[PDB]
Structures are given as C-alpha cells and as structure tokens.
Amino acid sequence: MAPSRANTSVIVVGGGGTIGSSTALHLVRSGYTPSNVTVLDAYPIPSSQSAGNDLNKIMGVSLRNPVDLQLALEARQMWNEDELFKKFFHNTGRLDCAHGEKDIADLKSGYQALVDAGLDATNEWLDSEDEILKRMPLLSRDQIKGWKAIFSKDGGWLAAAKAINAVGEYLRDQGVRFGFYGAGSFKAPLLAEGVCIGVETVDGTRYYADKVVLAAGAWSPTLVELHEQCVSKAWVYGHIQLTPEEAARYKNSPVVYNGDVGFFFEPNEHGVIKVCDEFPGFTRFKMHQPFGAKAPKRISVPRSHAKHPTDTIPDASDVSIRRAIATFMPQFKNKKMFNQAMCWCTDTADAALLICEHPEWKNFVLATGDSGHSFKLLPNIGKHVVELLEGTLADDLAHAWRWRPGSGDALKSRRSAPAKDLADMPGWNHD
Ligand SMILES: *Cc1cc2c(cc1C)nc1c(=O)[nH]c(=O)nc-1n2C[C@H](O)[C@H](O)[C@H](O)COP(=O)(O)OP(=O)(O)OC[C@H]1O[C@@H](n2cnc3c(N)ncnc32)[C@H](O)[C@@H]1O
C-alpha cells in the first residue's frame, strides 16, 4: 500500500523558482514531513535564472481562461492576508491602458469581463487622459493623448525575488532538504517498471522518492519530452537609476501597463525603476534532446542570463524599451538602462498551465506552462499541485491543465504573432 502523507517523499525539481517553491510550501502546509521534501534547483532559491527572481511583477486580475478567476482571487486573498506574503504586495493599483481603435475595443470588453466576474467595485473605466492623469499625475499629458485605461484599485506590484526568498527561508526553517548546482540540476527521472522512483542530477547524484514534480519553468520542455505543449520564450527588461529626489516623486505610483508599449513600476528602495516592453517573446531554437524524445528535436532552449551573464538583450529590444521610457517617462528618455536581461517563460497554446501526471511515468508530475502570467500565483498555485498529487484536483482545473499535445500552436499561443528567434534578433550576445 502507498505510504501516508507523513511518509510520502517528494522531490520538487525547480523548487528554487515560482511554482516549485509554492509546491514545496504547500507540501509542508498540507502536512508532508519537511525532511521528506527535497528541493532541487540548478541555483539556490531564489534561483538566479528563475523568472521570479526579479525586482517586481504586476499583481492584478486578468481573465484569459475561465479558471483564471478562481486562481486570481485565491492569489489576491493571500497577498492581502497571508503573513508570509503580505509585506511583499504593494497595493498601489494597476493602470491598464490602451490607445488605438483595436486596442481600446479589446480593453473595453476586458473591462466588462472584470465587471461580469464580480469585480466592478475595484475596477473603473477611465475614458480620457485627464482621468488617467488623476490616478497618476506623473504621466505626461503629451504622451498619453487618446489613451483610455482600466484602473484596478486592488492591483499593484509584488516584490518577487524577496517573496520567493521568504518562502525559501520558511522551507529551510521547517527542515526541507536542498540540493543546488551539480547536486540540483535534474537530468533524468529514475524509472522502474514504468514508475518514477526518483531523479538523477548532472553530477550523478541520485535521489529516491515516492513522487517527483517537474516545476522547471522554461526549462521544462528541454528536460523531458512534452511534444511542443510548451514553447519557451524570452521577454526583456532594463533598469534605470533615479536620484533620491526623482524617486520620491514616484513613491506609491500605480503600476502602468500598455499592451503596445510596455510597463513600469515605482522605484524600489534603491531608486531603481524597472521597465519592460511588450511583444510576443523570443525563442532560441537549437538541437537538444529532452529525456524521452525518440527522434531528433529542435526546440526553444533558454539562453540563461545566469549561465551567460555577459548577455544583454536584442538591439531591437533596447530600442523598444527606450521608446517605452520615452513614452512613460519623457524626462528620463536619455537615461542609459543597465542590468538589461532576458527572462524566460514557457507558453502553452491556450495560456493555461500544464499541471498533470505524465501519461506514462507514474508519480512524475508536470507543473509548468506558466505562459508569462503566473508569478502572481506564487502564494496559491502550489496548493493545486498538491491536490493533483493527491487526486483531489477539481475537474475544471484538472481539465484546463491536462496533458494536451493536441491542443494547438504554442509558438503563437494567445499572443499577437509567433515569437521570433534570438538567432534573428542581433545584439544580446557578447561572447
Ligand atoms: C520573464 C518575465 C515574466 C513575467 C513578467 C515579466 C518578465 C520579464 N511579468 C509578470 C507580471 O508582471 N506578473 C506576473 O504574474 N507574471 C509575470 N511574468 C511571468 C512570471 O515571471 C512567470 O510566469 C513565473 O515566474 C514562472 O514560474 P515557473 O516556476 O514556471 O518558472 P521559474 O520561476 O523560472 O522556475 C523554474 C525553475 O526551474 C529551475 N531549473 C531549470 N532547469 C533545471 C534543472 N535542470 N534542474 C533543476 N532545476 C532547474 C530554474 O533554476 C528555476 O528556478
């Protein structure tokens, strides 16, 4: 008979990242014995190459699939109420802006979706630049002519790296096992009679456990064969440095986002503003054999800034981010960004997660397909990964997250175009 929860060992591969750390946290909260939980990652939590290892991420409700509502409301509750997470949510609001006929129309129906989901109380439609300027006076009336926006009072930003670090300190304090670098870089599951019984890492270390969760983010489809269910893509950011006096003016600013321009956050405690552009992401295709492939594979394999710290971003991305600064912060349009880097996610065709047992390898569970929208789910997502492990996952979540090679084209996903490839986007490589 299977061991009880208290005696069930679980390896979380990618446990130094977002979904992995959340899964480990929820194993412990659910009453798995901490010393039976092993967190393996290529890098110490929060992993240097985790998409969650950043200054900030946006918190808000965005409804791309039906399950998104439950998941966002769960996350919102915990960012507000959970003592582990609360201090890292800054509830400054989110300004979701659009300009142009198409983008405005899409935003208007998006607003109605929020209303229809029951969130009328915390979302307001701003129908002119004058209304936007009321919610953030530091935007330039010259740059935002003809813009409209949704203002979400319940949104804001998340101190992402700090939050994962706090989870790591919880796990450490509880007695969770850690393996990093050579001792944490997964290469293969260990299989016996079609059951997964552990993993082996690049340095030959073998870990044995009753269950294994693969929460390896953008690396997931590089590590095991996923039949193009997830296609990994990079997005980009840069940092600019403000004087203390400049930074003080921006204190408690709402997050500002425009799907056609990018987004930016208030300065952190060091006076640094992080800026992203917005675009369909970049692949980096190369020949690579994930465990379980039965033919030659060309797949998008992350070019990791952690492994290649002299990398920056494509020239085109430097241009686009600078255009975002010129639009959002014209007074800063001549600052030189630094710490430019690529940040990796993996898209499913429908932008819902991939959280399911492997169809052949019993007790090996996928927990990936983050689709560029999942940091905000740090507090809660692990709860549902545990439910999946235990066979108690609700039908709607399980269906949305199921193994689905048939589902569609992840290279385009729900985005405006198929991602371009870093091979065709010069300027990031300084080898
Ligand atoms: C890139 C990005 C993403 C992003 C964003 C802006 C950028 C530039 N803005 C967001 C926002 O405003 N709000 C939001 O909610 N999300 C936003 N995103 C997306 C978000 O960052 C991601 O969706 C999410 O963080 C991904 O979580 P996931 O757990 O899937 O991925 P990860 O945190 O990168 O963790 C993966 C871990 O796996 C480890 N790894 C890799 N290979 C191995 C091996 N071989 N063995 C063991 N571990 C491995 C990595 O080290 C990593 O820690």
Numbering used by the authors: 1 to 431
The authors write:
N-valyl-histidine derived from proteolytic digestion of the N-terminus of the HbA1c β-chain. This study reports the X-ray structures of the wild-type and Asn56Ala (N56A) mutant of Phaeosphaeria nodorum fructosyl peptide oxidase (PnFPOX) to elucidate the residues responsible for the oxidative half-reaction. Fructosyl amine oxidases (FAOXs) are FAD-containing enzymes that catalyze the oxidative deglycosylation of fructosyl amino acids such as fructosyl valine and/or ε-fructosyl lysine, which are the degradation products of HbA1c and GA, respectively. As members of the FAOX family, fructosyl peptide oxidases (FPOXs) are also known as candidates for diagnostic enzymes. A covalent bond is formed between FAD and Cys343 of PnFPOX as observed in amadoriase I (Cys342), amadoriase II (Cys335), and EtFPOX (Cys347).
A bound acetate to wild-type PnFPOX is located at the re-face of the isoalloxazine ring of FAD. The bound acetate of wild-type PnFPOX corresponds to the position of bound beta-D-fructopyranose (BDF) in amadoriase I and the position of FSA in amadoriase II. The positions of the O1, O2, and CH3 of the bound acetate correspond to the O5, C4, and C6, respectively, of the bound BDF and the fructosyl moiety of the bound FSA. This suggests that the position of the bound acetate is the binding site of a region of the fructosyl moiety of the substrate (fructosyl amino acids). In wild-type PnFPOX, Asn56 forms a hydrogen bond with Lys274; Lys274 forms water (W1)-mediated hydrogen bonds with N5 of FAD and hydrogen bonds with Asp54 and Lys57 and O2 of FAD via a water molecule (W2). The direct distance between Lys274 and Asp54 is 5.48–6.03 Å in wild-type PnFPOX. In wild-type PnFPOX, Asn56 forms a hydrogen bond with Lys274 (2.93 Å), which interacts with N5 of the isoalloxazine ring of FAD by a water-mediated hydrogen bond. The water molecule (W1) is located at the si-face of the isoalloxazine ring 2.51 Å from Lys274 and 3.22 Å from N5 of the isoalloxazine ring. Interestingly, the related positions of Lys57 and W2 in wild-type PnFPOX correspond to those of Arg49 and the bound chloride in MSOX, suggesting that the W2 position might be a putative oxygen-binding site in PnFPOX. The analysis of the protein channels of the structures showed that the W1, W2, and W4 positions in wild-type PnFPOX (W1′ and W4′ in PnFPOX N56A) are in the main oxygen-accessible channel. The positions of the side chains of Ser62, Arg64, Arg94 and His373 create a smaller cavity for accepting and recognizing substrates in PnFPOX compared to EtFPOX.
